[PDB]
Design a protein around this ligand. Structure first.
Ligand SMILES: Nc1ncnc2c1ncn2[C@@H]1O[C@H](COP(=O)(O)OP(=O)(O)NP(=O)(O)O)[C@@H](O)[C@H]1O
Ligand SMILES: [Mg+2]
Length: 380
């Protein structure tokens, strides 16, 4: 039979435990770690947290500590439960559905930490607020320890600590990728100037710390250091408005070499790019086309295409949006339609102006793009 009883209604964290693939990267637990790290970074971005400490424990569990405002522990006026339980056990429950708690945040779904909870054998949360320390714990997504006061601390000492033990049953490998972890963490320090980021690995017995006042430029430069580039130092630019901002560092490696191509939205690494990256690409192409067309150095029958200025472009792109739109909980791609035009406009304007005031380096770049077009033409 196929009647009403055939329809099942999953509630709480059950959908995450039943369909893990839709909520996280099941390759390894690193992404679970990023959900937690992102939440701490959002506090730093809002200017509340000054540091985020991450610890990979010998038992392969992960602990993330921040000195932000701390997760709210008071009773929710409508749900009648401490905000903390709500945040940990309910999907689509969070403080980033508006811009009242954070102006620019990587979080927006009200799902992250609850996914960490659903896929962990155990989760311990500690909050420091009002000169008091609170504790609450879960196992397999279910609360096993009610919110309780575990002591006193300085009134000015506030923050959140999350320690979780991933359930190996949901991942290809239960081991945390160390290189991925440090790559993600260093980037946070680069993208949020002044915030101190630390990573203590107790499996391999190491400890690192990252804190950069400048950031972008050196990050790209060092990544390509020792490789011929054009121009000699990265082309950088930025624009900041109330609801949006864009920052970048880029250059080309025409003679070959490993390219660095990273894009971010509210410090969330968008590994699959998206509309913001499309904008950067289009802007660079529009400006180069203008330079070539005006200087009349474009051979008859030769038309530049995106590939001609993108193929060997190494770049780091960091965008801020009051209300981004990602294609999935993993946030690998930004699908926010208007961000393409936004980035494109800023980049084209900055690049054409830079080109016009750096004629020598510009002509070399132009030659690089044109020869690429002819190479591509002869190929077809
Ligand atoms: N370390 C923290 N400090 C202060 N508040 C926090 C912290 N972690 C979580 N919260 C809050 O709890 C809410 C729910 O977290 P979460 O379920 O991860 O949703 P999210 O922030 O929208 N992220 P995401 O689902 O990945 O887009 C957040 O929106 C914050 O209001
Ligand atoms: Mg939630």
């Amino acid at each position: 039979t196929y009647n009403a009883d055939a329809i099942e209604v999953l509630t709480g964290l059950e959908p995450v435990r039943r369909r893990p693939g839709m909520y996280t990267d099941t390759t390894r637990p690193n992404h679970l770690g990023q959900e937690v790290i992102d939440n701490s970074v959002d506090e730093a971005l809002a200017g509340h947290a000054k540091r985020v400490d991450v610890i990979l424990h010998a038992d392969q569990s992960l602990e993330v500590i921040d000195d932000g405002r701390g997760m709210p522990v008071d009773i929710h006026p409508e749900e009648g439960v401490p905000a903390v339980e709500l945040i940990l056990c309910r999907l689509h429950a969070g403080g980033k559905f508006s811009n009242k708690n954070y102006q620019f945040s990587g979080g927006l779904h009200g799902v992250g930490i609850s996914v960490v909870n659903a896929l962990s054998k155990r989760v311990e949360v500690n909050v420091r607020r009002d000169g008091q320390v609170y504790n609450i714990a879960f196992e397999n997504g279910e609360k096993v320890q009610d919110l309780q006061v575990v002591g006193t601390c300085g009134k000015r000492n506030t923050g959140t600590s999350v320690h979780f033990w991933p359930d190996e049953t949901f991942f290809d490998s239960p081991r945390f990728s160390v290189s991925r972890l440090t790559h993600v963490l260093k980037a946070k320090a680069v993208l949020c100037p002044g915030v101190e980021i630390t990573f203590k690995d107790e499996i391999n017995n190491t400890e690192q710390r990252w804190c950069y006042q400048d950031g972008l430029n050196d990050y790209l430069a060092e990544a390509v250091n020792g490789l011929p580039t054009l121009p000699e130092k990265p082309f950088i630019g930025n624009f900041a408005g109330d609801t949006e901002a864009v920052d970048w560092a880029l250059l080309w490696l025409p003679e070959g070499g490993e390219l660095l191509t990273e894009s971010y939205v509210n410090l969330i690494p968008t590994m699959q790019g998206g509309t913001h990256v499309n904008g950067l690409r289009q802007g660079l192409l529009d400006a180069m086309r203008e330079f070539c067309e005006y200087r009349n150095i474009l051979p008859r029958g030769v038309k530049l295409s995106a590939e001609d200025i993108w193929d060997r472009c190494a770049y780091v792109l960091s965008v801020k949006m009051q209300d981004p739109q990602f294609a999935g909980q993993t946030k690998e791609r930004l699908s926010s339609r208007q961000c393409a035009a936004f980035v494109s406009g800023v980049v084209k304007d900055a690049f054409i102006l830079w080109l016009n005031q750096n004629v020598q380096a510009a002509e070399l770049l132009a030659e690089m793009a044109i020869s690429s077009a002819q190479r591509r033409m002869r190929a077809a």
